[PDB]
Structures are given as structure tokens and as C-alpha cells.
Amino acid sequence: GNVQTSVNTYNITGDGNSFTPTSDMTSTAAPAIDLKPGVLN
Amino acid sequence: GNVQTSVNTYNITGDGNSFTPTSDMTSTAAPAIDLKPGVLN
Amino acid sequence: PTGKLWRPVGTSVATIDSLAIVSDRFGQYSFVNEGMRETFSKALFDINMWQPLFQATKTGCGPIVLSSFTTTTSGYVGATAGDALDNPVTNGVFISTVQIMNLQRTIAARMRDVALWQKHLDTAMTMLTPDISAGSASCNWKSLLAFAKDILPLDNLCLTYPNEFYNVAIHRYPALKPGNPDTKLPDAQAHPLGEVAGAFNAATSEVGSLVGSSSTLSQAISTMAGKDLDLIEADTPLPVSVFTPSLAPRSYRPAFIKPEDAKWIAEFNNSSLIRKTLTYSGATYTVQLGPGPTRVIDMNAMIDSVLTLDVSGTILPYDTNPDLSTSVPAFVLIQTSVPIQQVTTAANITAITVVSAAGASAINLAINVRGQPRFNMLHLQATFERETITGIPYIYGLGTFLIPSPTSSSNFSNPTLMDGLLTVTPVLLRETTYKGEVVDAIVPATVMANQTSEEVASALANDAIVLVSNHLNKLANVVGDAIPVASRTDDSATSAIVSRLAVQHKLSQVGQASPTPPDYPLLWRRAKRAASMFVSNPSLALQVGIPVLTQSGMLSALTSGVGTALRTGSLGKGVTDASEKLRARQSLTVAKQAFFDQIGSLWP
Amino acid sequence: PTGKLWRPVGTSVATIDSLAIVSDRFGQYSFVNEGMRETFSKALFDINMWQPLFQATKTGCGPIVLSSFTTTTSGYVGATAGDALDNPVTNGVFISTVQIMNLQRTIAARMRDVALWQKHLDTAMTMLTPDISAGSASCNWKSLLAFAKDILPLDNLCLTYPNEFYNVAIHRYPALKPGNPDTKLPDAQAHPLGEVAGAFNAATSEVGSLVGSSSTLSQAISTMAGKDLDLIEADTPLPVSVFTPSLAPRSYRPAFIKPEDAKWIAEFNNSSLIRKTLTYSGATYTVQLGPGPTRVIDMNAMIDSVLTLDVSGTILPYDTNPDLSTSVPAFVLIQTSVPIQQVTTAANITAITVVSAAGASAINLAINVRGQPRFNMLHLQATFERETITGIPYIYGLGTFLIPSPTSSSNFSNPTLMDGLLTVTPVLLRETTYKGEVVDAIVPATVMANQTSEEVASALANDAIVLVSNHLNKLANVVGDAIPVASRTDDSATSAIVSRLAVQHKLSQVGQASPTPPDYPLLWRRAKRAASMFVSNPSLALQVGIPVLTQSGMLSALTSGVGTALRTGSLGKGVTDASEKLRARQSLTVAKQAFFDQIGSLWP
Amino acid sequence: PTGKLWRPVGTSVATIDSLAIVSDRFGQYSFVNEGMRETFSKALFDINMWQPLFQATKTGCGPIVLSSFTTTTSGYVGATAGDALDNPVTNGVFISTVQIMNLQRTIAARMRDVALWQKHLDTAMTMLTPDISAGSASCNWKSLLAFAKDILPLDNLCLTYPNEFYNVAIHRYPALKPGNPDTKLPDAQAHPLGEVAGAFNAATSEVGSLVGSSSTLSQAISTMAGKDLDLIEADTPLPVSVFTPSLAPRSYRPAFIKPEDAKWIAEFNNSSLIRKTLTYSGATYTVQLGPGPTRVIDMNAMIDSVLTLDVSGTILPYDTNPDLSTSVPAFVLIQTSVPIQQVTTAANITAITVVSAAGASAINLAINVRGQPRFNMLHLQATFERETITGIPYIYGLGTFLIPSPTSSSNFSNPTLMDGLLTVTPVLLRETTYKGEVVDAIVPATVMANQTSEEVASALANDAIVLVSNHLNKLANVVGDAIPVASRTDDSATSAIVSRLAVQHKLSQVGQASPTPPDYPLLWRRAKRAASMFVSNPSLALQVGIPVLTQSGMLSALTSGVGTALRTGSLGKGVTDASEKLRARQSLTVAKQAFFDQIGSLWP
Amino acid sequence: LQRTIAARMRDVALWQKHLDTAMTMLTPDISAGSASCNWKSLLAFAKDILPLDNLCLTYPNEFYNVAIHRYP
Numbered sequence A, B: 001g002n003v004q005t006s007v008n009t010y011n012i013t014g015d016g017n018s019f020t021p022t023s024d025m026t027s028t029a030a031p032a033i034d035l036k037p038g039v040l041n
Numbered sequence C, D, E: 001p002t003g004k005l006w007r008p009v010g011t012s013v014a015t016i017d018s019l020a021i022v023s024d025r026f027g028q029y030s031f032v033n034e035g036m037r038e039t040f041s042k043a044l045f046d047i048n049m050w051q052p053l054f055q056a057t058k059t060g061c062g063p064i065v066l067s068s069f070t071t072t073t074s075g076y077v078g079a080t081a082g083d084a085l086d087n088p089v090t091n092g093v094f095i096s097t098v099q100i101m102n103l104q105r106t107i108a109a110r111m112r113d114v115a116l117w118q119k120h121l122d123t124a125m126t127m128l129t130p131d132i133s134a135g136s137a138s139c140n141w142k143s144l145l146a147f148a149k150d151i152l153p154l155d156n157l158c159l160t161y162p163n164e165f166y167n168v169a170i171h172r173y174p175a176l177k178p179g180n181p182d183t184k185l186p187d188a189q190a191h192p193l194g195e196v197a198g199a200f201n202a203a204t205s206e207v208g209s210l211v212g213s214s215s216t217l218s219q220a221i222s223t224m225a226g227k228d229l230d231l232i233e234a235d236t237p238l239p240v241s242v243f244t245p246s247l248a249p250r251s252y253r254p255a256f257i258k259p260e261d262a263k264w265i266a267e268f269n270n271s272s273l274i275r276k277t278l279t280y281s282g283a284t285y286t287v288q289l290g291p292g293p294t295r296v297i298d299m300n301a302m303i304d305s306v307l308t309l310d311v312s313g314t315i316l317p318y319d320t321n322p323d324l325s326t327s328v329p330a331f332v333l334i335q336t337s338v339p340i341q342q343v344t345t346a347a348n349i350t351a352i353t354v355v356s357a358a359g360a361s362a363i364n365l366a367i368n369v370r371g372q373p374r375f376n377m378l379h380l381q382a383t384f385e386r387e388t389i390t391g392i393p394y395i396y397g398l399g400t401f402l403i404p405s406p407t408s409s410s411n412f413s414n415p416t417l418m419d420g421l422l423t424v425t426p427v428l429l430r431e432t433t434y435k436g437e438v439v440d441a442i443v444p445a446t447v448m449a450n451q452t453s454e455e456v457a458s459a460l461a462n463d464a465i466v467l468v469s470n471h472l473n474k475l476a477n478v479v480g481d482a483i484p485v486a487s488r489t490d491d492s493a494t495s496a497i498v499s500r501l502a503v504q505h506k507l508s509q510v511g512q513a514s515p516t517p518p519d520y521p522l523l524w525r526r527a528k529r530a531a532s533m534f535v536s537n538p539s540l541a542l543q544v545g546i547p548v549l550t551q552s553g554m555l556s557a558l559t560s561g562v563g564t565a566l567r568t569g570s571l572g573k574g575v576t577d578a579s580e581k582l583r584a585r586q587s588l589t590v591a592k593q594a595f596f597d598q599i600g601s602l603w604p
Numbered sequence F: 001l002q003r004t005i006a007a008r009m010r011d012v013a014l015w016q017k018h019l020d021t022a023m024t025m026l027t028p029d030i031s032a033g034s035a036s037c038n039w040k041s042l043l044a045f046a047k048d049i050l051p052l053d054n055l056c057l058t059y060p061n062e063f064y065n066v067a068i069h070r071y072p
């Protein structure tokens, strides 16, 4: 967790972070991208 | 394979054709076209 | 915008009422939003492709432009006057009803036309696997052709139009590269109409196949949200409906199932025999309840099903005790006064109804199979109904024998035909059964590590256990499928569990010398086999005495992990073992190149 | 528009045949329609996300803009000169072939890169279930971190780049809200790149989960149209193909199946024994056809399959009648002159072929398992073929014994090894079997309520019955799945049936005193268990004597209901029991909050 | 573009750093790309539809325009400053986080609202199958209505709002055509809001149903790429993970399985008996290894599983040899010095551990079922672990009896309880087993035609064979499903094989008189049953001695054919037997028209 | 300049290893006079020997161009 500083806009051990799940926003990237023949073109 | 000539831009027995699969372009047409109620509209 | 187009019937001022679906002699113009043109274009595109075969065979009628079925009207387009008012579209592209009819029956008529040819092109195309998945591999064209000139059966359509099918083909198989006319050489690149799609399906060596790994994920995501794998070990009443129990009729072998191993089956454990009588079809028979305990299906705790006790291949010793022969085997209910397991003698058994006898005695149902006469496969069968047993505190279903005359010979026989394979089929899903009671809701978490080794395999078709097993089984295929719970990759699944074991083993160490700092290399590995043992045999998580898996945390934990795990797979999840997977694909293309080499010699 | 872009050849105006694909050295420019940019953008978007990890580890090469693989050409873009003429596009955005190659191998190369890291981020993320589905629940960050500082195994990648992975993470888990730099406090809202998608997956308390309930429907709709559940009880010839019978090899236990319970199996019901002889491999053996009826597999009405009669664990009494030992058990065909069931004595049996004997007599195949010597699991096995039995009116497959010397001891034995578990596997799907005849088409409606209790379980692998069972079974999972046939919600399924019962019971009341006005509360409930009994055990609808379900209306009715029922579910079908379902999710988040509370204390 | 919108925080000059997610009091504006508006519009569109029911019941709040949740900001929109710099969008349409919240909870709240009504509308709509699939068929409206006025149970919502539900309905069922106000007659055409979608689902008589045939293909394509059917007979090491083995616990019946038919099970084939002793729980018992060979589960070659030997319904002759009674049946390991199958007498058996005994002797576990006392269904069960047997060259699991006192009576008994149904469940997927060894990778091609008839059915739960069977089984359902391997259509599957047979039979003819020119009509037909026999029983392709199917070419061939075959089906694949399929649909509509005719009379 | 030369150094160190098992797999180095070996054969030969997991079979004239600069 050693301080970095600019590489990325947020420090991990940074001031006032906060792990806190909300039933409201179910974390998700993009897995189901459609590529099948008919659907991709 | 009898010569045709114009019907289509390519003769089958035409000069220098070439069957040659490439792992790169998996042949593909359009089978999975989406038509289900919600998805077609 | 979307929906049918509307226009101010009252003119000029368009309010939420001065509108009206602009219908007319053509039907109603429905708007053709951007994406919906992608489909009808993608559909027509796949037909235009077959242009060279439509002319050749004088069918068709020219290329089908989607711009022939639409129009350029303008107005407000919504689903209802109210909301259509907020979509003023000018010169949008709408397709009138009567048109939405042709673009339909045209794509349908043409679709048949091509579907046919397209089938001939194929039996010839795939008839020489034009698809490899690692590196390349050619096959000198002359041979290839002069070869299929053979194989192809005389009723194809690739022999009547070679380079009328070939031109259609070139656009579907980037394997066949036509020789350019003004340099008389191939092209290196292959330009099939499916240019992009075909590029994005190739098994890319970096990661298996985007089209594969992508779906195997969205597929799992579907299930995860669908069945309701989430909430799999929820601790609170849940309607059986929430478990979508279907096609669920499990079969057994009672007269073997211990009474304590499955509440729905009590036994007459009494000293002597309990010969009773009953006038069935005139003739008087004697139900036995012989020497042994004679386990009988209890009626209460028996969800109005369709009990069908099959008695076949099972022994039928009418050879020794002649007493057995002559007795028509039959499933019979038995209402007892005092509760069974307390019912001593005949005077105790209230009444006995032959709910389903087998016509013809035990000497026509037989069939000699090497001395030991067996039972000609036949199915006796009641149709128990929750309320037909209202009030009646004690009543049991028993597939016994109904001896026409008890004797000394049948004094150690005990005619319970229950050794047969009985098949109960819950005929009324809404109601489940648990621990012997009939309910309308389960409490998942309750059924975990609460059954015993066989208090599971002895479950009753569509009972909590069988439901809290059908459920885990889905969640078991989502992990088995999407997540890599079968390699040393300490995946998201076996990872969710490891965090529980830590937090658990960590507080059990709090208070007292704490001489043991948590392990972790040992915890990771212990939770790996825990998550693995689950994917393996989903059931286990119900049996009391299973390491890790049966602690309240896990599962409730696992699933919610596996959950978010699927909702992030990326696309290149296939990178897992995409090395040996790749090396195996090159292995195949090397062997397939070997094939083309013979096609290339034999038919020069 | 769609397809490759085309400009004419001769020049000037472009007339069909004057237009050719504008092939370029790089490749042919194929148009990139609006939606197809959504994908390649959605794919690149998921890669750019990992920007902070690409720089950290000096891989990558800057953010991948999709605008680096395309171009701004202009011309006519279609699938063929003819139709491309109706898509004049100006300065459209096309991607050349050689480019469609990089955007491919780039997204592939980068996809590997991230697929790896993305896997480490995960074993650490899901390693503390950042996903709840009811209300909230925090876990003081310090602890959390100082905790994973432990668990995470020394070879992750979340320990080598904490806030290089954290920055990637913040965009995937709206659970981790980074503390704002100039107020040093969270944000309430969480802004992960998947802003919308993640919003629309949360288990919304009003209705289960839109992403779930939506798919569970489109999923069912797929099947409904696919297999051809529609037309499930159609009354007219249907090619077996229409039933896509696959992976279909059912196994039995003949020598038990009554001849009338399944046409494909006749029996030699004759008075005495029928000892015949046959020189097999020199040695002369005697086929027995012993005391009992000896049910044998008939050859006609036997779709050229792969019969594999297994004889194991089954008794082998060579102990008593020594006659039995020494005889090599073997499956043998038996051509009889007079039809079986009319074949009295030896002179009647034309010939007997040992289609597959077992090397080594019956005293090496044995194995003592408590007195009663069993059969060492071995599989005899013919490969019956429709025409190898041409003309031959009578012929039967019999898995008998082939005794090397019949004696008085084997005078009541009857060596039929058919008591073994035979497994026929139709090896030629196109041809089915019904009521004893081989056909190419079924008549669905005919097979409904036409089999008996066991004229179903005794069906022959890939025969109408087994096909008209594999079919109902799909339709049974569409209702079981999508429709709520398992709650008091008088669903679309049990509703389609109720309307039939009414219309039915209503005309049966017409003519005569009509003293009974139709019920309805009783009809709704009767049809509810009818639709329910179906979802339960799809099979039943074939057995003669099943209430409601077996009348011609139903099914043909049911399906077409369930049909339209799926094509309207809406999206919020999950509103069903979305109350207890919700209350169960809060139940889990309360227990998971309990977990975070320990992570929060133990590791302060 | 896509992602959140950014703007030059440093003003004017927007570089790859002078950007910053434009967040604020509303959250972060995320861009709403063209297609993502299709969804939220398609979702809102399906809600607006229910407008007439929202006003009627004073709920709702006016029509929901998607233009109420968005905005018209402008800036650069990407996933990260770097890539967002290449998407300058002006006056794009973004939805702020707090808005992405309402459009969410609104569509959710409204979704409940309608989900309910929408359910009532249905029990009434489908309650008269408004959907036929061939030709038309009316039902005079008066009757219809006056009819449902009955059936519909008193708690619907279609009785409280008839033409408040009717107006919602008219837009979902193009069956109900409302009578036009100013000509008081129908309309011929029916204009339901789902105008297009409903047009493209009708079972078009040319080809089954586009929505069906389309999916049945994309569905198969998913699998083909997913599981990894491709590479199905790859000849090279493949991680077991590549086979996603899940929910895989197979059960047997040892003490029957020949040792050579399955390496994981050796037998003590020794002359006399081998009575050993062992102090178990104080009391001294004698393991027997009786008269017969007593096949025992070998421990090496036994993937650390969960062996659970069930002993029930199986005979228990304590009646004769009294020696048997009193002995507690129990699964026991047996470490032998000299390798088994070479272990002659007691002094040879190193030690014997009772890994799991059954409390209570053999006279409480019994239960008389007609003379022959059976075993009350009970499950003994070890938990074998790879390494608990480290070093130990010879050790075997044996479910024997443990007699408390061997006698002359038990001199021909042999107490192996292995005749029971043992169920091994691999508890650690990563490791597989092949030919007796434990491995981490299979070599597919090796397992083809390498097992014997029963060297397959005797496979050990999660062993190469069982894995190279679970795999073919998927590929078997892709062909069975998508491809027409069940009609005389010489499909792409049976076609890929035919080309192999030719190329094969053609070179075997090269060199020597070549008196036989290849056949083809006979080859097509031979390969048709080969591809067909595969779809039928996928397994066979593992057994030595199967025509065609087991030559190295096929399969590796088949799949790669079936592969490209699915990636071209077109859409109208349903044209296959779309004639009888059509004629069957007309058959149903004729019978359903018959129904409407009664609804039309009974309730005039 | 350090971690780049390091990251890239890995990248090449790998390929550079495949190029080699194929290059030295035909001693491209003599130390007295010359000695050729007709290219066709040479290539068609290594097309064999080289084990299926090299990287000189997946990029022939993508490795060849790297090679030409290391083997005179």
C-alpha cells in the first residue's frame, strides 16, 4: 500500500476511502459482448 | 466446371484460384440474427 | 423514438390529445429506429449474397433493398399520444403495416429459395473442412475440384452451377480465394462478405475464442440471475415457486429405506405377524405384515402425488411357500387406530382398502429366469390426494400381497412388494414436503448440512431436500462452466470461501495464547478443495459432516462471489490454458493439412 | 447500409457491372454500421479501463481508439453491385481488411494482457464479496485492506501494484468508493465505468432482477420456437427429424417386459422345453428356451440398432444344476418357421445363429458374493440391421446360455440371460418405431393417452413414445421455467386448460335438464393441477387414464397458450413472490454485514 | 463514443491530462450511445403501452419519456482521459448518475405496477389461445366476451376494467381487432404496438419460424465455441479444466467389474481363504476375503474422492451361515506387502484399517422381504485422499463384513459387500485418472477407440474416459440440435465424414490392380449412419471396434465440419420438412377453429 | 529508460529464444571459407524439425526479418 502519488488519480491507502457495497449498483464490467456471426454482422 | 464467362466475376476452373484455409478468418455467413420480441422491438 | 407514428388530427397544435396514430390505406406507419434497420439489413444482406444463384436459376427478382419497404413520413412517434408527443421526428424512416408484411413474406419467400441452395453449397463445402484454427494450410485447387467432381452425389446443385455457387461461396468461405483476373494469382487476404464477423471468430491464439469465452459468460450470467442462484442459502421462507420445480418425479426402493432416514415412510415393527382380512371383489384376502418390520409409505407427509409402485424382476417365491401363489399382488392403504410403530395386533388396524390390485394371482405374473421365478414387469398405482386422508391421523400406503389363504408356509415370508422400484411423482408442485410436513415455503439455509448421508438419497420427489439440491445443481453448473474451479488458479469461487475460512479461523484464535498465526497457503488449498468438492457433487452441501462446505458462511458466500465473478470475466477469459489449447489446435491443423495433402495426390 | 463499399470500374456513372468492390492493397473497405461500432467500442472500452495497469507494467502502448483502425471513404455500400447501388454513403466510416486484422489481433493481444491481471484483481476482489443485493453494508477500509494484506497469496499482482489495481478496480466495483482528494471523504454515489449496466443489474426490490427475469423469458422463447414445442400434439405425420432425437440410447431389463406392454418383444409361451442344437465353433451346444415363457427381443420392429445385453451381478446358479456351468453365455438370433407364440417344438425353429458368444464357460464368468455366485460384469452385443433380416418373417434376438450338454438338472432352470440390463442404441436416427412397426414419421396426437402405465417405461430407445416424451419434456421445462405453474397464481398455462374444461363441460351439459351450472372455482382448481401434473411429470400425458391432461384439447391447447404467454412476460415477471424473495435478500445482506463486522475487528 | 463524459479541467486546450471526468452535484454524466437508447426506449415503450390502465387506476404519473432523464452536455467522452480525447462529442445526450438512478427505479416501480395488471390481462387472454400458426380463424366477439364473463375468477382485474384492459390488450394481441368508430367494422390488418416483432414471429409457411431457426443456430454456435467442442479429438495434453467437469459423481456395482475392464479395481484371486484379524473398537473381528476373487477398489489410481458404498436391498444370508450375522458390515482399507494378485496368505496383508464401520451387527440391518433378508439401506463411506496413501505401494479399499468369529458355515460365503451400489465422487476436479494413473491433462485422441465395450461403462467418475465422454456429449447435442443428422439430407455432418472415407478408401486402392473404383452412393450412406450413430450414442466413439467412427480422421473431422456448418445456417434452416411441419400447423388451427366454434355456440 | 529496457528486454528475450532454437538448429556459423545450402531445402526442412510450440512457425517472415539482422 506504499504511497505512489500520480500514476493513478487515487491512492489506495489514500485519505478517507471506503469499501461499502450497495444493493443498488451490482459491480460489473463487460463480459457478454455479442460477437456471434449474425449479430456482429 | 465448364467455362461460364460473365454470369459471375469469377470462373470456378478459372486461372490461379486457391483453396487455402487460414486459422485467421473462420468462414461464416449470418445465422444468429436476433429477432426475439424484445430485441427486434 | 420507437412505435407507430402519430400526427395532430386536430391540426397544427400537437397536444397530448390532438394526436392520433396516423393510420390509412396502407396500415399504420411504425418507426424504424436505427438498430431495427440493422436487422432487416443484416437479413436482406444475407440474401443479396446469393445474387449469382438467383439469376442463374431465373427465380428471385433482383436485389432486395430495404429502402423499398420503407417511407419518409414525419410526425411524432411514440407508443401513446402522451409519450409520442416527446419524439417529434422529421422525415424519419417508417415502414407501413402492409409493407411490414412484404419485407416479411419476401424475406420469408427468398429465405426458402436460398435455404435450399445454401444447403447444397454446404454438403459440398463442409465436405472438405474449409476451416482450420491454427496457422494455415492449402490444398492445390485443381485436385480439390477434380475430387469433389466425384464425391458430390448426382442430386446436389453444385454440379449444375459450379461457378454460380462458387461466386456465392467465395463470400462465405474465406478459405476459397478466387484467382484475380488481371495478374492470374490469389490475393493473400481473403475478402468474404462476412469480413468482420469471420475475423472475430477465428480462434485467436492469445485467448481461445472471443465469440466462445464471451458467450460462456453471458450464458452463465443468464442462469445466475434467472433461476435465482443468488439467494441460494437464504435463511427465510421461500415459496416453492421460487425454485421452478419441473419435470421432477424421483423413484426409489422402500422396504429398505429406514424410517428415520426419511420421515415419509414408517414401519410396523411388531413382534408376531398381523394377519388382517378384507373382502376385495367378493373374495376374502389376508394382508400379512409378515415377520420383518414391513416399511410402509406413510400417507401423511406425502404431497398428493402419483405413486406408481413397479414390481418387476423382483423375486416371487411361490415355489416354496405355495401360500404366496394364488395371491394377487396389490398396493393397499391401511388405516390404523393407534399410531403405527405402536400398532401391535389386527384389532388395531381400523380398515384396509385395496387402492389398486393386480388382476390374476401370483402364478401368471411370474416368469422363470433360472429357478427363481421373477415378476413380469407390471405397475400397480394409486393417486394419493392430500385431503382424501383428512382427519385420519394414521394411514399408510403398503404395496403388499393380499394372500387368499394364510398358511404355515408364509410364516417367515412377509409379502411386502415394496422391494420393487416405486416411483412417486408430485402432482401439484405448489406444495413441498420437509422433515415429514407439507409446506408452501422452504428455508434453504435450514436444509444445508441437516440431512445425513442417505437422508438425501432417500429424499421424496419434490421435497425441500430435492428442491435445495435442484437449485445447488444449477449454481453448480454456473461455476463448473464459467469459473475455473478445476485448475490451480485460486479462482473467484475458491477465493470467496478462503476469505471466510480466514475470518473464521482468525476469531477462533482470538482470546487464549494465539500460538497459531493463521496459515493461508493451507487455507487457500483447503478452500480450493471445498469449492471444488462443491462443483463436483453439489449435493454434499446438505449432508451433516462435510468439511468447510457445511458452515453457514460458505455457499451464501460462494454464490455471491461467483456472482460478481461472472459479471466481470472481461471477454478473454479463455486465456486460461489458452497455451495447450492453442498447441492442440495447431496439432489438428497439422493433421488436417496432412489430409489435404492426399486429396492433393490421389486426385491429381 | 452494410457490407463492403463499392465504386464503379470503367468510371463515370456506376451502373451495375460498372461497380466492383474497391479492393485496395490493404484490403476491401467494409462499412462499419452504427451498431457494429458499439461492439468494437464496447470491447476497446473494456480494455482502456485497464489503463493504469498498462503503464505501471510498461506493456500496452497507449489507449486504443477505434478511430485508429477506420477511415472516411465514401461510395456505395452493399452486399452486391445490384443492391449496393441503393446505399450511397458519403464519408461513411469503413475499416479496411488489413485493419479489420489489427483491431482484431490488437483486441486479442491486449485481451490476453488484461485477462491475466484482471484475474489477480479478482481473486482479491471477490475475496470479500463486494456484492450485496438488499440495502447497504460497509466495512471500515483500513481493516479490509490490512486484512487482504494477509490472505492474498504471495503470487497475486494486487500486492505488487495496490493503487495501480485499485484504480482499475474502482471502475468495476461500485462498492469501493475512493476518497475524494479535496474534502478527504467518500461520495455517496459510486461512479464505476459500468455506470448504467451495473445500475440495471442490482436486484431491484420491486421485481427480482430485470437482467434475470428478462433472460429467463427470452431463453424460454428460444426453446418454444426452436425445438418446435409449438405443434406438440399435432395430428399428422411428422418426420422424426422434426424431433431432433440425439444422444438417445435407453436401457432395459427384458425377460420381464410383458409382450403386450411393448410390441418389440415376443415370447416363446410353449408347454414343454424346446432344446435345439447348433455347431458353434465346432463344439455343439443346446439353446434351451426352458420352463418359463422366455421373452425374446423380436427382430422385426427393432430399428437397426446396437443391442448390447449386459449380464452382470445377475445370479448364475451353476452351483445347483451343474448343467448350467460349462455353458458359454451368448446372445443368439433364432429364426423360427411358424410365428413365435405358435412355435411348439424344436422342428419349428428354422436355425439359430450365435451372433456373439462369450469366450470361457459359466465357471470363470462367475464370482462368489455370499453363496449366490454372480456374473462378472461383461457385455455381449450384436449390431442388428433392418435388412440383414429381409424376407425372414420370424426371427428373434435371445440372450440365452448355450449349454454344452442339457440335463435333468436344467429342467426347470431356463437359461435366458435376458434378466440382465440390455441397452439398445438406435444407430440410424432417421427411422423410428411405433406399436411394433418401423416408420419415418410420427403422428404426435396419436401417441397421447395411447400407451399404458408401462407401455411407456417399456418404450424402445428412439421410438415414437420415446420421441413424444423427449418433446413434451422440453415444453415441460419451458413452463416449469418461465411460467409460474407452481403457485396459486392461475397462470397462463393452467388458464389455457381451464378454458377447455369449461367449453367441454359446458356442451356436455347442453341437451337434458342442465341441472348443473358449470362450477369454475372447481374448474380453475382442477385445471391447475392438470397443468401442474404436466410440468411435474411430462410423460403422464401419454398414459391412458389421466384426468384432463389426456383429452385431445389440452396440450395442443396448453402449449399454444404457454406460447403467447412467453411472448409478453414484460420484463418484471420477477414480481412474482418478489416480496419473500426480497425479504430473503435482506436476510443475506444482514448476515454478510455481520461478516464485514469481523473483518473490521479481528484485523483492526 | 461510450463511457463517462470528460471536460478540460485546465480549460481550452484539451490534452491527455487536462481532462477529468466531469462530475458534480448530480453524479457523473455517462454518455448514452445510440443503441443504449434503444433499450431504455424499448423498456419505457413497453410501459407506456399500459397507459390506459395507469389512469384508470390513478397510479402511474403520466407517460415516461426517456428524454426526462437525460441532458445535452458536450465534451470528450471516453473510458479514460487518454482515449476520451478521441471522442469530442457536441451536445451529445448523457444521463447523470443520480438520473441513471431514477430511470432505473422508475422503470422498476412501474415495472411492478404493470407486471401485476399484465398478469390479470393474461390469465384472461391466453384463456382463449389468441394465437394460431396457419391460416386464420375467428370467433364471433359477443360469445367470446359473454363467455369470459364467466370463466374469469372473481379476483382478476379484467372484470373491474374490461375496456381499460381491452385498450392495453389491443396493443399486444393482433388477434383482437377493435371495431373502428366511424364505419363500425374491423380493419383486416391488426395494428398492435409490436407491429414488426409480431410480424417476424409468425410461423412463416416457407420456413418454420425465423425467430426459432435463428436461435437454435446461435444457440448451437454458442456451445461450439464455448465448452470447446472444437478440438474435440485433439492429439495432445489438455488440462482437465479445458473440460469444465462439474456435477460429476458416477456410481457403480464393483465385486462385478472385472479388474482388466477398469484399472482402478484389483482382485485377491487366491486359492483358499485369507482370514485376517484386527482389533476394532476393542472387539476383534476377522476380515474374510472369502472363496471367490473378492474384487476390491484399488487405492492408488483413485483421485482423492468421496467413496460412499451403499449396501441396501442386497441379500444378507445370516439365515444360513449364522456366522454372517453378528458381524458389523464395514468399508475397510487393506495394506498388503506383496502386490495384490500375488498376495497368498494372511501373513502377506500388512495391516487393515476399518475406515468406516456400521454400528450394530448383521441382524438389525436386516429386514425380511420374503424369506431372503435384505439390507436396510445404509451408506458406509470413506474419504480417500491421494497422499494419505503416500509411499504405500499396495493398499485397497474393500467394503467387506468384519465377522466377529469365522466358522465352517462361512467357508463358501465371501462377505464382500461390494455387490452394493458404490458411488465415488471426485472431490478435487483438477486431477483426472487414465488407464490407472492420476494425471492433470488428457490426450483426447488417445481415449478414442481405446476403451472396450465395458472399459467405458466401468469408467471412474471424472476420469479421462468420463471426461472424453462428457465432451462428445455436448458436441453430440449441437449436431443433434442444429444439424439435420436425422433425415436423408446428407447434411454437413455426415458429409464431412464421407469426404474422409473417400480420401481414405481411395488411397487404400492405390498400388495393385485398382479393380474397385470407389463407390460413393454406398460411401455417402455408410458415412450417414456413421455420423448418425454418433449423434445417437456419442459414447461409442471410445469403443474399439466401431465402423468408421473410430478411425483417427472422423470426429476431428466431424466437429470442424459441424463447426463451419453452424456458422452459415442462414436463418431459414427451418425450411427442412417445413412442409409437413406447415401441414401440421394448419391441422392444429383447423382443430382450434373447431374450439372457437363452440365458444361461439354454447355461450351465444 | 530502466524499466522500459527491462520490460522490452523480457519481451524480446522470449522471442529471441525461439528464433534461436531454429537458427542454431542449423549452425549458421562456419570459420573457414564459405559454404551454402540451397534455401528451399533448408526452409522445407526446419518446417519439420522445429517443435509445434516455437514462434518461428507462427511468424516465418516476421522472425526472418529480425533474423536477417543477426545472422550474416
Ligand SMILES: *C(=O)CCCCCCCCCCCCC
Residues within 6 Å of the ligand: A001, A002, A012, D121, D124, D125, D145, D146, D148, D149, D152, D158, D159, D160, D161, D162, D163, D165, D166, D169
Ligand atoms: C500495499 O500494497 C499493502 C496491501 C494493500 C492492498 C493490496 C491488495 C489488496 C487490496 C486490493 C485493492 C484493489 C482492489 C482489491
Ligand SMILES: *C(=O)CCCCCCCCCCCCC
Residues within 6 Å of the ligand: B001, B002, B012, C121, C124, C125, C145, C146, C148, C149, C152, C158, C159, C160, C161, C162, C165, C166, C169
Ligand atoms: C464442373 O462443374 C465440374 C465440377 C467442379 C465443381 C462442382 C462442385 C464442387 C466444387 C464446389 C465449388 C463451389 C463451392 C464448393
